[PDB]
Amino acid sequence: SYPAIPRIYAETTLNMLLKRAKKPRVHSIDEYLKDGGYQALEKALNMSPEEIIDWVDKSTLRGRGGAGFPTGKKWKFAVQNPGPRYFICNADESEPGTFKDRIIIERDPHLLIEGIIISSYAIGANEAYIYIRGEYPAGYYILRDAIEEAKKKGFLGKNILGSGFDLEIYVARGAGAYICGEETALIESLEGKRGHPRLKPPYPVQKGLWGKPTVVNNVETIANVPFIISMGWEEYRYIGPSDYAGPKLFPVSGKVKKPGVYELPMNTTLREVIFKYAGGTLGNKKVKAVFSGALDCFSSEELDIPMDYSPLGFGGTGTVIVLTEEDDIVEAALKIAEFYEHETCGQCTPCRVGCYEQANLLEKIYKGEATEQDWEGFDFVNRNIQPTSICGLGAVAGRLIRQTLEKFPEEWEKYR
Amino acid sequence: FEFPEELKTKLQEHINYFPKKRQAILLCLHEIQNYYGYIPPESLKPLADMLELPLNHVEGVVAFYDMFDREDKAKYRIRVCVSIVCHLMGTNKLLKALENILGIKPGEVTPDGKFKIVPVQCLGACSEAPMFMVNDDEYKFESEVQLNEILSRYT
Ligand SMILES: Cc1cc2nc3c(=O)[nH]c(=O)nc-3n(C[C@H](O)[C@H](O)[C@H](O)COP(=O)(O)O)c2cc1C
Numbered sequence A: 001s002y003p004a005i006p007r008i009y010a011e012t013t014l015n016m017l018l019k020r021a022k023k024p025r026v027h028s029i030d031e032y033l034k035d036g037g038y039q040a041l042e043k044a045l046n047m048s049p050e051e052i053i054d055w056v057d058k059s060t061l062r063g064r065g066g067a068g069f070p071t072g073k074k075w076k077f078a079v080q081n082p083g084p085r086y087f088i089c090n091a092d093e094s095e096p097g098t099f100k101d102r103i104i105i106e107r108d109p110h111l112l113i114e115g116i117i118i119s120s121y122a123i124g125a126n127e128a129y130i131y132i133r134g135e136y137p138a139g140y141y142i143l144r145d146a147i148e149e150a151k152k153k154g155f156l157g158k159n160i161l162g163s164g165f166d167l168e169i170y171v172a173r174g175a176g177a178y179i180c181g182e183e184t185a186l187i188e189s190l191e192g193k194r195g196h197p198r199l200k201p202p203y204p205v206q207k208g209l210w211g212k213p214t215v216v217n218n219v220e221t222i223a224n225v226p227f228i229i230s231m232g233w234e235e236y237r238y239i240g241p242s243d244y245a246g247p248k249l250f251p252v253s254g255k256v257k258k259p260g261v262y263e264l265p266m267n268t269t270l271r272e273v274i275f276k277y278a279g280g281t282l283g284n285k286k287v288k289a290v291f292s293g294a295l296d297c298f299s300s301e302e303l304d305i306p307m308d309y310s311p312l313g314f315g316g317t318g319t320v321i322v323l324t325e326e327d328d329i330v331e332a333a334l335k336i337a338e339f340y341e342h343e344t345c346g347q348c349t350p351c352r353v354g355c356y357e358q359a360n361l362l363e364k365i366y367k368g369e370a371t372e373q374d375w376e377g378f379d380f381v382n383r384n385i386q387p388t389s390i391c392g393l394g395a396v397a398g399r400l401i402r403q404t405l406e407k408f409p410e411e412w413e414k415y416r
Numbered sequence B: 001f002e003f004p005e006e007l008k009t010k011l012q013e014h015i016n017y018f019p020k021k022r023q024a025i026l027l028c029l030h031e032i033q034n035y036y037g038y039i040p041p042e043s044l045k046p047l048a049d050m051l052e053l054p055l056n057h058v059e060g061v062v063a064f065y066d067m068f069d070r071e072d073k074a075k076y077r078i079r080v081c082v083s084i085v086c087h088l089m090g091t092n093k094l095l096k097a098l099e100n101i102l103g104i105k106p107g108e109v110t111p112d113g114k115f116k117i118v119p120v121q122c123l124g125a126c127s128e129a130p131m132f133m134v135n136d137d138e139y140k141f142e143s144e145v146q147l148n149e150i151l152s153r154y155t
């Protein structure tokens, strides 16, 4: 018995990550095993850890938490530092528009767990954590239940399958801070402290949980790990462009006929996502803009860009929010500004004051109560949230709104 | 302050779960919030003790994390998303339906004390916008009538 969770639509052309998860229900260990589940774990244990890293490195797999860091290389970094080491699966996923990770957690927990155990073994981590946001209660319970199943079947515990490798996966929960999505802040939360991000460097792989090498990876990234071992690194590289190979989950929301997660190769364009896969816009309207979560804003003239991690690519977490012609740009920015106002942790002054003032001043503009200096002040604040900041929230807090002012000056002018 | 034995038992369940006791604060705080229908201030001195942390440490945590509430006790927390996508799809229509059925605005509690509306950021369900959660249960807003029926289940 799990809490009520909406049936988010899921669709795939690759049939890897969404093979089971395209169906909106919990798939249990029996159903997973029938599909060759845990075969990859078994193959992994016969290999040495280093070999796995080679495979994941050669896979060209990159981080799915938005920074797009090469997983294989990240793993090598941790292993150069002496043990003990720790493995964290990042399941905080609180970014607006981003609901890709939960559907794996909720529908195919075992894909995740298989990826964690393999990942843990690669870096010689005998302790592993999942930090899942507190607003995903059904995910938490589903994962706890799934861990027990794997344990009962001998996938978790001491001397897993006579390998000699010991692993326990503990499930931690957040309590409503977006900032806990940042890896160092997550680590602080896991240490029972407030989620205040640590100054990097040191990186977690050098120094992380209890000052020990810690690899922090996203849910989606870890989910690819079983396929890499199962298929082999060469077969995996043939999925999508060699440039950015492998399955990518795209959470599409806003004004579309068919909003949900779409499993697709990364050479797919943003136009195809919206029109080919997402069904086009509601009411056959012209697309005004796409918000890449709370990170980027794209105009309708930038729709023919690959959904990859290239410089000209969409990038990020692939989160796709579509705004139509009816939707008010300024009103959208207000919500985005509001988002960073709430989620800034406040450690850094430009970030602390900047996020507040952007949100507060922008509300004045939208309501028509903004003085001449409020306008000039808002512009300045938007361009000075980033200074001295120790984590990426503060750097990107003004990024999207800036792009609206640039790409949509006319609608902004109306508000003056 | 003294916890009821059953609640004490679970709190203590969480502390033994992880290798280090202090790692169970959010889980324990969740249990307390879930049991009492809010975070009692008096509950904290006891919990720090079991955590083997200072009271201050625990209080810094409670203030930091938005899911815990120390001012208002509600049986059922109606977490209503207020972020962009949900706003585009019609958060306002949802707020309206809540006002009409329960006669309360966001941040307010019914005189019953059974239902409290909490405005939150993205709930990770943007394709099913507008979104709301009644405690741990999560639903899409369709219409006033639909909302009534769901709310009817929370007694
Ligand atoms: C403010 C902020 C929030 C973040 N939220 C998330 C998140 O919810 N999930 C996630 O996996 N990474 C998130 N990240 C990125 C992590 O810090 C980290 O880069 C990532 O989890 C590493 O995993 P990956 O390399 O597999 O992507 C966030 C970063 C910042 C700065």
Ligand code: SF4
Pocket: A179, A196, A197, A343, A344, A345, A346, A347, A348, A349, A351, A352, A389, A390, A391, A392, A393, A394, A395
């Ligand atoms: S940049 Fe902002 S969110 Fe990040 S640590 Fe500094 S104050 Fe906190």
Ligand code: FES
Pocket: A096, A097, A098, B081, B082, B083, B084, B085, B086, B087, B121, B122, B123, B124, B125, B126, B129, B131
């Ligand atoms: S914007 Fe409300 S659930 Fe994402």
Ligand SMILES: [Cl-]
Pocket: B019, B020, B021, B022
């Ligand atoms: Cl301890």
Ligand code: NA
Pocket: A135, A136, B123, B124, B125, B138
């Ligand atoms: Na949620």
